[PDB]
Amino acid sequence: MKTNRISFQGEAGANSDTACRNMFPDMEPLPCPTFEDAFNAVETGAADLAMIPIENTLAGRVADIHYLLPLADMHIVGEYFLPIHFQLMVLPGVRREEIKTVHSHIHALGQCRNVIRQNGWKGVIAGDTAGAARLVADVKDRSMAALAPRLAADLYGLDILEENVEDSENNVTRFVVLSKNKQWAARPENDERIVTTFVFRVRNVPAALYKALGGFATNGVNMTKLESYQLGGRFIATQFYADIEGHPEERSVQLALEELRFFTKEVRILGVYKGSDIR
């Protein structure tokens, strides 16, 4: 029985929460303190899906999908890209002149340095960004401001003094949607975008990765993610996490994968899912 819950790591109002609401508006987000807990909610049947961030353009917190996903009995059934924006929020009726300190995650402060220095404020560490909004609403100190996603302003009843105050623009986080059941996207018939995510092992010897990539190179398969991971503590063998643009039933991918299987061990397809238009 489907519980209609989608787990994420963090507090209510976070960017992960925004991703759940944007892509699955009719679902009920389920906050979890850690990524592992967000995975575990799907394994136990508490949540139908999990929304897990894996890439962020400006060195943000992302889950080690290469470690967690292969240990799960789970599959990637979608992806999502959310542009990240920060909002300067205060208690209702608090004026700009009253603010002395701005509370956010220590990492968030460094991405919003321009407005903190231009206004002469002191950035203050907070355990969690959405928690910073929660903290301001709970402490009820008018001098304390928070930097949080737009969603946290509405949830915690805080006023947004300034919009999109982040230093850099074009800050995007990539999520993957996880499920316990193996759902593959249908083979494209009219040039639709499909992503296949898989892992494989090679020996840690020269050209071993080269051998594994040979089939995609000569079959015109575009690879869009590739991360190395040395197995155990030793340097004897290496596992790779990879995304390709293609469906496993396509002849070109079938040929690349067959060549990959001769040169590697333990090839596991972790998902076959629709790709975002940003590609």
Next chain:
Amino acid sequence: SMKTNRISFQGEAGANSDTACRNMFPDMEPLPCPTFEDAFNAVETGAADLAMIPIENTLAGRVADIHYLLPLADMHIVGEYFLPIHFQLMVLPGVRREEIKTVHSHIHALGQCRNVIRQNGWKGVIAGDTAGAARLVADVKDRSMAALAPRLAADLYGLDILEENVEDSENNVTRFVVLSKNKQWAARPENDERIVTTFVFRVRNVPAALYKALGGFATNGVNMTKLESYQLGGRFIATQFYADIEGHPEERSVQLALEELRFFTKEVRILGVYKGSDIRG
């Protein structure tokens, strides 16, 4: 600037990062910093001569995004370090196992030590930092409070280690890189010494583009031990790669591979040339 003999690390005194600083640079004075960025900035401003930064951990622990930070800093890798990660159950001096009710640690640490919390009927309690949990236990002086922390924190806070190496899974290793503001390359090996070269390069996001860039390493016997993709900007037009190879840029084989890499890439930047840990053998 003036050499301060300080090495910055992210965390509180007694952390695993501090352990790496003391093991590898015993005569330096570790300089705690609340964030990785602050540990970088300590080197940029001259507060610290070196920075000890974790970049790989076997069980999904917290590491700095070296691929983002190091290319934007003007810093170099001048060393690496591999530290086996272990947790110690520590208590106030003379406290008996029967007295403990709560175990305090970082939430990720509690998640790696579930067996000893369950076997003894204790309640794990969240703490912001693992070494901080040891500090908290020594300060509160509540005999019922135990901590899970690195061995170093026990010596610093005068705590008794009730049980050793209590973590669930073994083979938990963290890889650090040693950073510097000034460039220094290890000398070219003459007798099969271990040397690592770390670099970034960009290719177009089209089929076979990475394949071309690796071609030179493949046919010259250059072993690559790390490779990470990073799609540039918001678009999917170009991709940056972070890579470690075992070799020195003056060796003929590496010279040829890098030359072939330069024909097939843009913006090749060598980020460091440093001695490799014996763990590579």
